[PDB]
Amino acid sequence: ALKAPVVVLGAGLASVSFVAELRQAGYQGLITVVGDEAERPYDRPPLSKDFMAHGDAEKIRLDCKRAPEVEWLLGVTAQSFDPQAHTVALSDGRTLPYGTLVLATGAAPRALPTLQGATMPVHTLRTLEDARRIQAGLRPQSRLLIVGGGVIGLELAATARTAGVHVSLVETQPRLMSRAAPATLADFVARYHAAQGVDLRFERSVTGSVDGVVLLDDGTRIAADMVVVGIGVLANDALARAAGLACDDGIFVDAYGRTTCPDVYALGDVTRQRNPLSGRFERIETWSNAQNQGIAVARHLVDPTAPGYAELPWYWSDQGALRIQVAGLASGDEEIVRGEVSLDAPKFTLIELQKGRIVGATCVNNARDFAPLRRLLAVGAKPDRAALADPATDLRKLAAA
Ligand SMILES: Cc1cc2nc3c(=O)[nH]c(=O)nc-3n(C[C@H](O)[C@H](O)[C@H](O)COP(=O)(O)OP(=O)(O)OC[C@H]3O[C@@H](n4cnc5c(N)ncnc54)[C@H](O)[C@@H]3O)c2cc1C
Ligand SMILES: NC(=O)c1ccc[n+]([C@@H]2O[C@H](COP(=O)([O-])OP(=O)(O)OC[C@H]3O[C@@H](n4cnc5c(N)ncnc54)[C@H](O)[C@@H]3O)[C@@H](O)[C@H]2O)c1
- List the CATH number of the domain containing 34: 3.50.50.60
281 and 342 share one domain: no
Resolution in angstrom units: 2.4
C-alpha 95: how far from its chain's center?
31
State how far the Cα of 312 lies from the Cα of 292, in Å rounded to an integer: 10
65 and 129 share one domain: no
- Strand-pairing partners, residue 281, are 274
Contact 171, 154 (CB under 8 A): no
Ligand 2 centroid from CA 87, angstroms = 35
State how far the Cα of 128 lies from the Cα of 42, in Å rounded to an integer: 8
State how far the Cα of 111 lies from the Cα of 307, in Å rounded to an integer: 38
**Among 270, 292, 313, residue at a domain's last position:** 313
Backbone angles phi and psi of 273, in degrees to 5? -130, 180
Instruction: Give the angle subtended at the CA of 296 by the CAs of 294 and 297, to the nearest 5°.
Output: 70
Q: Which residues line ligand 1 (CB under 6 A)?
A: 9-15, 34-37, 44-45, 47-48, 77-78, 104-107, 125-126, 152, 236, 239, 268-270, 285-288, 290, 315-317
CA nearest 11: which of 47, 46, 42?
42
Q: Is 199 exposed, middle or buried (0-12, 13-18, 19+ CB in 10 A)?
A: middle
Ligand 1 pocket test, candidate residues 236, 293, 314, 370, most atoms within 8 A of CB: 236
C-beta neighbour count of 133 within 10 angstroms? 15
Atom 8, ligand 1: residue with shortest CA distance: 317
**Could you list the residue range(s) of the whole structural domain that residue 152 is in?**
110-232
178 and 207 share one domain: yes
Cα-based distances in Å from 351 to 278, 368, 382 = 16, 14, 12
**Among 172, 197, 232, residue at a domain's last position:** 232
Method: X-ray
Q: What 8-state DSSP symbol labels residue 328?
A: E
Counting from 1 in the atom list of ligand 1, the atom nearest the Cα of 107 is 30
CA nearest 125: which of 139, 146, 98, 100?
146
98 and 247 share one domain: yes
114 and 215 share one domain: yes
34 and 100 share one domain: yes
Indicate left, alpha or beta for 365 from its phi (over 0: left) and psi (-120 to 50: alpha): left
Residues 6 or more apart in contact with residue 67 via CB below 8 angstroms: 16, 19, 20, 22, 23, 31
**Among 214, 232, 250, residue at a domain's last position:** 232
Peptide bond into 113 cis (omega under 30): no
Residue 20: helix, strand or coil by DSSP? helix
State how far the Cα of 348 lies from the Cα of 84, in Å rounded to an integer: 55
CA nearest 346: which of 236, 189, 210, 232?
189
Ligand 2 centroid from CA 100, angstroms = 33
| 382 labeled part of a ligand binding site | no
189 and 251 share one domain: no
170 and 248 share one domain: no
Structural domain count of the chain: 3
Counting from 1 in the atom list of ligand 1, the atom nearest the Cα of 286 is 19
Q: What is the CATH number of the domain that holds 390?
A: 3.30.390.30
User: How large is the angle between the packed helices 183-196 and 151-161, nearest 10 degrees?
Assistant: 20
CA nearest 228: which of 210, 214, 211?
214
Q: Any idea how long the chain is? A: 401
- Strand-pairing partners, residue 69, are none
Residues 6 or more apart in contact with residue 189 via CB below 8 angstroms: 154, 176, 177, 181, 319, 322, 324
Q: Which amino acid type is present at position 235?
A: A
387 and 375 share one domain: yes
102 and 242 share one domain: yes
State how far the Cα of 326 lies from the Cα of 363, in Å rounded to an integer: 7
| 13 labeled part of a ligand binding site | yes
Edge-first strand listing for the sheet containing 206-209: 206-209, 213-216, 221-223
Helices and strands (H and E) in the chain: how many? 9, 26
100 and 126 share one domain: no
State how far the Cα of 68 lies from the Cα of 99, in Å rounded to an integer: 20
Ligand 2 centroid from CA 119, angstroms = 24
Contact 178, 186 (CB under 8 A): yes
Q: Is 93 exposed, middle or buried (0-12, 13-18, 19+ CB in 10 A)?
A: exposed
209 and 126 share one domain: yes
Instruction: Give the angle subtended at the CA of 257 by the CAs of 72 and 30, to the nearest 5°.
Output: 30
Cα-based distances in Å from 164 to 133, 172, 196, 317 = 18, 26, 11, 21
